[PDB]
Amino acid sequence: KENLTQWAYLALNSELNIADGHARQALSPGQQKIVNELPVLWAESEQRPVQQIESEAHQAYFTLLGQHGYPAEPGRVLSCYSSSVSMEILARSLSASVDRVALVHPTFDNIADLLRGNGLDLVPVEEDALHGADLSAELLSSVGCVFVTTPNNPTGRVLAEERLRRLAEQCAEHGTVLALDTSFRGFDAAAHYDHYAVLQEAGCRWVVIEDTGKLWPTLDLKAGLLVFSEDIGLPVEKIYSDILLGVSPLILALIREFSRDAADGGLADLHAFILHNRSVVRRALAGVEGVSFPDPESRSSVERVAFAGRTGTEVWEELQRHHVFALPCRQFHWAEPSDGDHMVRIALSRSTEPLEKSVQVLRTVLET
Amino acid sequence: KENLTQWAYLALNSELNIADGHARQALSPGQQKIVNELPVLWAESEQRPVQQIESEAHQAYFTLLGQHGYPAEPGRVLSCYSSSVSMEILARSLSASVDRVALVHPTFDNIADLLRGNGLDLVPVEEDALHGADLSAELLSSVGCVFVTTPNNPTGRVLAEERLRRLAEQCAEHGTVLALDTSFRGFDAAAHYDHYAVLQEAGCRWVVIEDTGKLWPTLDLKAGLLVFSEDIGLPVEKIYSDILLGVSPLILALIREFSRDAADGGLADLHAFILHNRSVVRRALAGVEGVSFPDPESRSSVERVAFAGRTGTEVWEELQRHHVFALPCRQFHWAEPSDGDHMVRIALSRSTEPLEKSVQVLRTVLET
Numbered sequence A, B: 001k002e003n004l005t006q007w008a009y010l011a012l013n014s015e016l017n018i019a020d021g022h023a024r025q026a027l028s029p030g031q032q033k034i035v036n037e038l039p040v041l042w043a044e045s046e047q048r049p050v051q052q053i054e055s056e057a058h059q060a061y062f063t064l065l066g067q068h069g070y071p072a073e074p075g076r077v078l079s080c081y082s083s084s085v086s087m088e089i090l091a092r093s094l095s096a097s098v099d100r101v102a103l104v105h106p107t108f109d110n111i112a113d114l115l116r117g118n119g120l121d122l123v124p125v126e127e128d129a130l131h132g133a134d135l136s137a138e139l140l141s142s143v144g145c146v147f148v149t150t151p152n153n154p155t156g157r158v159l160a161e162e163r164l165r166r167l168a169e170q171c172a173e174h175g176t177v178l179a180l181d182t183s184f185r186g187f188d189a190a191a192h193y194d195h196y197a198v199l200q201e202a203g204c205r206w207v208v209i210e211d212t213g214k215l216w217p218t219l220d221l222k223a224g225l226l227v228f229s230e231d232i233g234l235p236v237e238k239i240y241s242d243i244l245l246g247v248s249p250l251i252l253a254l255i256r257e258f259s260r261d262a263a264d265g266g267l268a269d270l271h272a273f274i275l276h277n278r279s280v281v282r283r284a285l286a287g288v289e290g291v292s293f294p295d296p297e298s299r300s301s302v303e304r305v306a307f308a309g310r311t312g313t314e315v316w317e318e319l320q321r322h323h324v325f326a327l328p329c330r331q332f333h334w335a336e337p338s339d340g341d342h343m344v345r346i347a348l349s350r351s352t353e354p355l356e357k358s359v360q361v362l363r364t365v366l367e368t
């Protein structure tokens, strides 16, 4: 298994999948009511111009999460099948004019595998240095792009506004591209200050990749949103049009409707449900010997756990035998895999029952 | 402007869109019954292992179109959000080891764009050369892949079985990858002989990209299916896992149901529908001096129309002023654009009434 997706494949057909980060819990009542009008949404998607549906979907999802200054003129937000598709467009776009990319480490490994597969070299930036300290002028001058995941995956760490401001400002000095993956944006209110405000204010060249997938159990019906400053001067628009005409108006209508249910109280319900499920795993494992939780303040839908006397791979292997699937964290540490030798990632975007089943099996594996 | 997808953007929100090749006619009564029961399918897609739904959708789609010998073991058919995304996966896999690609000419231009975009040089192969004769040894040794769109877009030309047998043999003796794009397979029974049987019997390195999207008005809910030989020797699997975990189980359910409606008589209905709309186009242009049809036998869901005394650009600009959006053909001829200077392409996957209005305007235009 050469990336976390190949580990996650093994989980997809198991009742005890706690590996991939997609939302697989039950629909709420308000979400089921949306599913129930799909034949009506379908007809609306046949009948209306996609540009109207698309605008309403973007307006609903950005405002929902505080990004009021998002560029709303047609063309500026590029709807992609997935955040990974948005990522490939950007990585291939960079490769034309950039050699090296400074990337937060750790982070989800397909970000690095895509950047490398498109010919970019990476220089890692540990999280401490990223947040708690400016970045070295020797660094910025040697890279064409800076790339942050916030909320990060697997750590949940949020880039504070103050530091986002400084970072965009540093990038403006060097004419460097500043890129953000905000897939997890909706789980943590610390991420809902208007990033398009600080970004457009610094006036650097910037790219943001939003994602609607993680948040709601939509059966992987979703969009990645690629937003770029007017001065990006990367060929993201042409490469986008090489790949797709657009996304399905029905998926867009569904984003709109799920965004509106989130704004009528569904997002608070979701933050609570994720908190409950985080409590449930911590309740069952903090008292075990060796077990610590390194992201004590994470609000993300995935949770890391650390053990002191065995390797995260070995926990994975022992877990498999009882039909439970999580992720070994080595590969999140894409620049030094050993950094994640003693950790596994657990998915919380699951209904509480099979989650509890899984951690109790995790308990027993650890008490061996 | 830069490619045919960008011309196609102009049409997306207008009543008289006859530009992109997507299926946009109204649902058949049988298809609307699938849609009516989306909530049921949604609850199926929650409860069941996506492996089973995926197996059922593949089996249904392949057997519908005569492709019985397709590799059915899990993992040999990779489901992608779209044909283009399979194409991005393929093109970037080739660049690892191939410098030059022989590509049928004309063909849909994002195939050439995605290849050139990923670092590959292209060599055109005209249609007559491809279908009626061996490819030379000179050509075959200068190239690491041969790429054929069949049925071709925009011409509708289908690569017959004896020529594919011979081409695949040729590719085996040179070690070349034979790559096919069979997105339009459903529209023409001449393409329903078993491709996988001849590729496997020849024992060449091969990849096929199947596509469910073109055939049914599913609001762009579709899958590209990337099928490869066990010895393909391209990183196609690695790069697939980089981009995605899989596609929506709902989309896979939809494919399964539309494929079964198709096998129940719907495909015969489609074929008759497309034939009628082709007859609508051509009879509407009957007595107009200077019109011809370059592909008199095509059964594709797109139709070329040629003009002795007018460029396709002029015609397209004249149609635009009456709010009718077609495609200029120049960019289909991705190696020599003037080859297409006198044709436009008309999308036939439309309800008959808006298509008839558009061509009656075309008729008025041409009589001026």
Ligand SMILES: Cc1ncc(COP(=O)(O)O)c(/C=N/[C@@H](CCCNC(=N)N)C(=O)O)c1O
Residues within 6 Å of the ligand: A005, A008, A019, A020, A021, A022, A082, A083, A084, A085, A108, A110, A149, A153, A181, A183, A184, A211, A213, A222, B241, B242, B243, B244, B245
């Ligand atoms: C920060 C960040 N940015 C983009 C994506 C891609 O999201 P997408 O899948 O396109 O919707 C993710 C997804 N993380 C999931 C991976 C499961 C899907 N695997 C692949 N896509 N290779 C997880 O960590 O479990 C992400 O965390």
Ligand SMILES: Cc1ncc(COP(=O)(O)O)c(/C=N/[C@@H](CCCNC(=N)N)C(=O)O)c1O
Residues within 6 Å of the ligand: A241, A242, A243, A244, A245, B005, B008, B019, B020, B021, B022, B082, B083, B084, B085, B108, B110, B149, B153, B181, B183, B184, B211, B213
């Ligand atoms: C032979 C062939 N292979 C793949 C595809 C991609 O299908 P996809 O669109 O990915 O589902 C097409 C699509 N042709 C359509 C629509 C073009 C939309 N533009 C982009 N996708 N960039 C047309 O001819 O108008 C094709 O003909």
